[PDB]
Amino acid sequence: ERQELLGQLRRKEGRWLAWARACQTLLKNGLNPQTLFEATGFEPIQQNQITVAMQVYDSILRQDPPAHVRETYQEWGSDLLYELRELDQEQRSLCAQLALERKLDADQIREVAKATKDFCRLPKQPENFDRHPGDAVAHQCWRLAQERTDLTERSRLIARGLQFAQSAGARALIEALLL
Amino acid sequence: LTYYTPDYTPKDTDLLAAFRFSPQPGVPAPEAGAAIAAESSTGTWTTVWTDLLTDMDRYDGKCYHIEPVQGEENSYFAFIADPLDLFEEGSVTNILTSIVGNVFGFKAIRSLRLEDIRFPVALVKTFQGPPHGIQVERDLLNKYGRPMLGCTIKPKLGLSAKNYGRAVYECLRGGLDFTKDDENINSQPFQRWRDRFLFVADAIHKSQAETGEIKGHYLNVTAPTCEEMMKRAEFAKELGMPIIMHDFLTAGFTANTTLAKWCRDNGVLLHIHRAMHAVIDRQRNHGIHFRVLAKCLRLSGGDHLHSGTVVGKLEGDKASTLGFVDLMREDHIEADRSRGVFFTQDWASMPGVLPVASGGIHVWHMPALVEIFGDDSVLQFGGGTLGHPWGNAPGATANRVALEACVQARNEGRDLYREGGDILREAGKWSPELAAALDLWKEIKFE
Amino acid sequence: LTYYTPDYTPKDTDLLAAFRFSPQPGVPAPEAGAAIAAESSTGTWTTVWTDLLTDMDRYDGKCYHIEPVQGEENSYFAFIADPLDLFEEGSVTNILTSIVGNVFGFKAIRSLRLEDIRFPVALVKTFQGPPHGIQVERDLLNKYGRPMLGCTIKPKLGLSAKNYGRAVYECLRGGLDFTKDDENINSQPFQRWRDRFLFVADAIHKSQAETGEIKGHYLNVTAPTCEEMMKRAEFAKELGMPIIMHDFLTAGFTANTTLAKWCRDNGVLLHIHRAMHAVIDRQRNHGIHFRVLAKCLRLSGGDHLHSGTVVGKLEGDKASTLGFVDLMREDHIEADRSRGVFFTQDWASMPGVLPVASGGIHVWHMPALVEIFGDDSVLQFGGGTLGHPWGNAPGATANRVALEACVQARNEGRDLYREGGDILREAGKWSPELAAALDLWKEIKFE
Amino acid sequence: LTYYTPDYTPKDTDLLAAFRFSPQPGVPAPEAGAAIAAESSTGTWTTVWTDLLTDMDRYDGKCYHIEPVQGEENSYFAFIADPLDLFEEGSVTNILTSIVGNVFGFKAIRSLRLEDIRFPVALVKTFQGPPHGIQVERDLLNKYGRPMLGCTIKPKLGLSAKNYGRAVYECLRGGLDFTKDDENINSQPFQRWRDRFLFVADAIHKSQAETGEIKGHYLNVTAPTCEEMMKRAEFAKELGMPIIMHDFLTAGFTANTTLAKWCRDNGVLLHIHRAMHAVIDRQRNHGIHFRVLAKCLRLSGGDHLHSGTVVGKLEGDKASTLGFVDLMREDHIEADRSRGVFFTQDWASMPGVLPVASGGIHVWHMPALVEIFGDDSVLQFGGGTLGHPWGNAPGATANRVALEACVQARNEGRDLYREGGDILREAGKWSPELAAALDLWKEIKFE
Amino acid sequence: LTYYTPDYTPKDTDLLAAFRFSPQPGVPAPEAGAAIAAESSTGTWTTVWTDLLTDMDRYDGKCYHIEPVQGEENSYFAFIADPLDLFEEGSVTNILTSIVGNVFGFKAIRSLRLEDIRFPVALVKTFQGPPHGIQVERDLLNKYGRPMLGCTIKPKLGLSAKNYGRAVYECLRGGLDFTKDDENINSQPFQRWRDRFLFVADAIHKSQAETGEIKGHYLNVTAPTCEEMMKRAEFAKELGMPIIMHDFLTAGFTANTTLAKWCRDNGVLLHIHRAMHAVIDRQRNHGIHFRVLAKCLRLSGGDHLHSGTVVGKLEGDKASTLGFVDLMREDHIEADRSRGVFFTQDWASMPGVLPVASGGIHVWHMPALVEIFGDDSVLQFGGGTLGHPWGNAPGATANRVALEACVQARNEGRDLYREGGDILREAGKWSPELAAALDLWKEIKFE
């Protein structure tokens, strides 16, 4: 079924999707994981890295990314989208648009994706709050920053602790702290 | 005895351990806290002839806090602090000996439970660490997308050399990743430790020859003497077995640290069975928590660790179990009381231990499992009454099909806690073994 | 699950262990007993493909009791039974792993406490035993009429080479038989393990040269690795120290059995410091009893054993301790529930372990101390606030005078538990140090 | 290349090293600083194919500062930062290999000098440390109030087995504390290493027999092969010599640390003679500083280490030496640019190394010496033309008399930098050897 | 001090070393030369009591020259000598310790640079030599007509076991002869030290299975202690790797001589990385020259040696490198000042070390490379920005193709310094990878 479709893999031609579309279709030839990299040139660790955000891109065709979140997102967020594998269809594009409007060092959303995973588990959302990474982070300090007692380990969440400009509730609840 | 809460500005190294504390009545609370602080080191200001000359004030284990338990009668959390120099490099035994060796049961309080421990960056770095990382273990095993598979060989006993090893070959050729001995198949005179190792070894080798996947069995080396332990380990390396299993708490930390340093020396993966744990960690008012053993056993290194599962447990207990699952894969962890992590602990690139759950779980629990442990874990089977009425190798094949379909359907993005039963139903449409697995149990516990 | 009370005539070998048992309500009692019996071996009749073919009925751990506790709500001891072949020769670790490794906390009962253990004659004989007998230890030490003397060097820390060495010399010379270093005085970077051994060794050496009595110090060899342990032990034999001390429960039974076999191999006496023995044995509904550790630690041999004392304790507790205290020196022991010995146990000439008591005891309890432990024991001092203003060596001299007068006045036949105070008081008539000891405390507790 | 000064908030572990930096003209300054930062790790962001898939941003050695030198043309101090994971536990060799292995001479700048290095508390605790502390060395030597004494045996060569050992006998009999040979003395075919060790050993033993003070002379073990080195060093251990001397920089840290680990594994002192430390630290624009080297030596684990003296040197240079002199006795040191401490450094109870000064110093320099090094040091003699025209034994005796009488001046309270000449004048009134020492030189350099 | 120029008739053994010498003003020139001669051995005629009985005149290090530098202010090379007996057999450490250990920075002269060294025939035939010759290395590798190929892996970190193992496959398979990791790669927390070896080893073995050429990787064994070093190096031989790499100057000559004697003992080739060289050899007035390290490192044997390259430096400096480049291959070398050879040196059939150049040179310098090092060398790649935009294995093939064609061109007789660009242009006419190599750079630096 495949003639000369590995030469583009061999020559390293294509941005990033011409790698992943190719490897996923090619994986149903008969060769195992230790055969496609035993020639073309693809480490197993990375062979799986782009062997999922393939399917995360299949997952994020819920909303259309409005031509400002797909320009340089054609072959980027490799480990960024690789690590998110426990998100809710309703947040996979919502966490990615945060990662492309925040511009931090490539692996930083592994920690928000755990507290977000915990946020979409409690039988019922908290009232005057919504399900989002911006709110989860803001509500993450409630069971952390608030739990804290000292100004040394309680004033470090004045920027990363909140920054949920997507929920007034958290902003209205983060007012009695200027004490 | 004035160490009650002098606010201390608790510091970088500091060994900040905590305690679930319950006095006997007729005892004021912070005096008993400073009693803990004095009993931890240099008891109760023991009067010497030099106390008028020199002040012993460099090594005081020093309490600084008191806070009553939310929703409890006569109990509070005391935060202890021990500066640096009370501990040896290399030892977890010295850690436990210094902290809790005599402090419990000092006939003033009713009960006491060592709940948590903070390990500093300047003590974490001087230990051995695990023999291999999660990364390095996946590197040696080429298992890159899914959790690892395992079952326990049944029955326990009366199932001798050819019996046991060729049952291992059948149950492993069915498609699993690992098989283990249980805790008590040491060198017992119906089944000598020699030939079990030989036959299990040959079974692994022929199974690697057929299936083309790297395979392994958890060999038990729980030994009476340390020389017996090193001898059985050296035979395990002589025939090239990738992993050995060794219980930690009954064998002891000196044997375990020695065996871990050996596994670093020869490059063999290391499994730990948490036998005899329920003696110490069950009651909610007296003992130590399994979390403290989990951090200490990440230090005295191991590559695997039984941790148990969450099936129908209480919500806060499930959150606590997730808490100390998170204490051994992440290397920078914040502090949640409701998950039971009282301290913000760094690990300074120690490549933490894989957890592995083993309870009475069949395949319908599998869509919960990949929902809970994510990807970085090993999953067990074969505990209770789950004898496959077709066979053990068909059971292993059905297990492999089940986990492959579950990992791929989690990759599908279908919220697999909700639809995992239907996932397995469409998965068994061509595999008759998985159809039998559908037939033998059910999943209508809850949504 | 039909292993309730089938009598079956409990037999010679049989490993007849017992349990203090407390269910959660909604549980019938003997079904939970057979649940203990099934969880001890081959859990809950796990269904296999050979069941219909072969009956697994040679290694079942059937119980034979259900007796409610006299004076307790929901509490009745259950006598189990495990035949022979579930246990390895040489190991106490396999004993604990087989009996209580997973049985506790199986989420059906409220609580469970391993209370007692019967060891058969055909398993007792295959272990190492202690390195030396009470007989043999007296033979090596020439201490033939009195209990042995000991104090703890105070303070705990900040008391380095010379400071720790010179202090030991005075305390030892004063007239004691032994001294023991701080439990957590392992190789900590303010006090390296090298020079403490060198100075204590020289200290003891010089002491003997002067006093003409065989002397010794309890050297601590609690080590991280087993190779560190063997290295420190080999240095302890290189300079000729008669005894080493080593805590058992945090270091672990594999290290302890190895070290005991080493002490047999080189002929050195062996002390064991019960460290963290309350984190398991304190609560009266959950854990194991210290008695079971005492029998297991007589097996994985040791020549001494901290056992604590009876000063103002409860009557049944005092008797309980005595019960287990006489369940080691004797080699043929009957069964008393009120002393806590549930089984009639033989030892087949194992020369059992000396006990040694260490609590907050001054000389006033000297008459009572001997009155309790008779002659075959070691007695400690220096725990709490008993700093002798005159001096540590005057304190040791007063101690020696006190014990000599107490042993001789017990030989006088006058009630030592009635005329104790008078004896000591009258004795101090020429020794001013003992007169200061009379001055510093009192014994008007009772008759 | 954007790492210029992004302010970084420099952190706890961070390995904050500094540099004396001088570009070639036509080079902008912070680009060359980020060139240092890139050359320290992952050079100039080496183009790769995984750079468009993964950002390599966890291990960047990251510069953050620029500050021009006060009173210098075309030079500034750059503060580098390397986070944690670029360094192995146990190695100083990996430290030097990572920091300065290729960074110097990269053909863009004129010159570069590694000036300082701040070790973290989570990396300096994982090293061995010295074999013995200043405390522990005084404990083994019973020298409690005064600095230690030493002379070099003269001449260097042609002074064979009976000559050398018996020559040290007189010197050691005189009253000195130590007597070490010069670097060039290893196993050279006019003087085989065997018999020098034997005769020096016998001289030490007979001198201890006569004088009653613990004695010991440095025994160079600088060896070609590690096996040979250990072999010759082993002899000393068997002959019970308390200390061995071994040069560090020509023999190598690899062979040094290994020997240092064996030094604390047998309990023997350690003498590190800084040989070849002028052709790597002399020029003020290119090299590494002795201070940095000194820190590394402390990490290795040496007891003594030649640190030279201040006799008529420049004020800032004298202070500089003093600044680094304390950088190895104190364990918590602040930061002075004029002294040397560029960044505050903790040591976490590493018991730092004794310094020892060896220059062309006679006894009139002795009232400066105890003025400078206080009490915690060793003092040398015998460098230049100071052949005592009476004799070596008398000369040594005179030296001891001087220091002994001097140390009294320090305790007296006479400001001994001012009156030390008159102190020696009243000291020589009964000792004729010290009177000859008064005769042979003078002290009127300055007040 | 009379050793100025007494013409000496400089002899056969004589250790005739030289010096680049620069006084401070106010110093007469030959007195400072005799000061060097006295400081080298038995300093400044140190007085003694046997100076009027025996004349110390057998071991003096008198000089025999004082010629001013052609084209320099205050700079004249001195020719000091040292007869035989100041040096141990087997040691380079003793050589450096005797010659330059304290001579530099003796506060009389401004600066001093150890420029050259003559090794006698009765002292250069008593050292181990290299483990294998150039001949013997070609014998073990079957590489008979061309220089060997090698490209350092990139990135420098974050590129772990399987990722750093599979990446070596392409680089090696593509067609190279060797690959080598950088100094900073030793045992780190982000990448074990044994794991990497295993993966790397396997890559080599499978690549030998496919290509049919003997292949190898330069494994780094820079270790903290000696035991660890030997231990890690021992594993390499067990796995069967043909060569190990080990930096010399930071690890130290004792470790290096021991490792070289080990490589003779097991027959493994030996690579040396010249890390930390630029600290010592860069400035033209102070230090030692890399040439002296090159001769000393030919003695303390090694089979390879990084030596750099003459890409486009000054002609005067270019020749200098060549001068020291022929101080290993040849075994009978004349003396050129404009080349480095200050005195003719024999080697008595020591089979000298292969050089290897590693700079920012791509395939454009390949034609020139063959022009300089002839045939007996190894050539490196991958330093700066030369990431092949096709791939590393296409780059490897291109590299081999280039050198291969280049070698042929040189063999043809076309004066390849002139036409080498056109040679590569006709070479890339069928290889597209070499055409990309033509595309990415250029050669129009000069004719």
Numbering used by the authors:
A (entry chain L): 13 to 191
B (entry chain A), C (entry chain H), D (entry chain E), E (entry chain D): 19 to 465
Pull verbatim passages from the article behind this deposition.
RbcL subunits are arranged as a tetramer of antiparallel RbcL dimers to form RbcL8 as the main catalytic core, along with eight RbcS subunits that dock at the top and bottom to stabilize RbcL8 and tune Rubisco activity. Reconstruction and cryo-electron microscopy (cryo-EM) of the Syn7942 RbcL-Raf1 complex demonstrate that Raf1 is critical for assembly of Rubisco holoenzymes by mediating the formation of RbcL dimer and RbcL dimer–dimer interactions.
To elucidate how Raf1 mediates Rubisco assembly, we obtained a higher-resolution structure of the Syn7942 RbcL-Raf1 supercomplex expressed in Escherichia coli using cryo-EM. The cryo-EM density map of the RbcL-Raf1 supercomplex was solved to 4.28-Å resolution (16,022 particles), with variable local resolutions from the central to the peripheral regions of the complex. The core is composed of eight RbcL subunits that arrange as a tetramer of antiparallel dimers (RbcL8) and four Raf1 dimers located at the peripheral surface of the RbcL8 core, sitting at the interface cleft between two neighboring RbcL dimers. Raf1 contains an N-terminal α-helical domain (Raf1α) and a C-terminal β-sheet dimerization domain (Raf1β), with a flexible linker between Raf1α and Raf1β. Raf1α competes with RbcS in binding with RbcL, as both of them interact with the similar regions of the RbcL8 core. Two Raf1α in each Raf1 dimer are interlocked by the Raf1β dimer (electron density is boxed), clipping the RbcL antiparallel dimer at the top and bottom sides. The atomic structure of the Syn7942 Raf1β segment could not be resolved at our resolution, likely due to the structural flexibility of this domain.
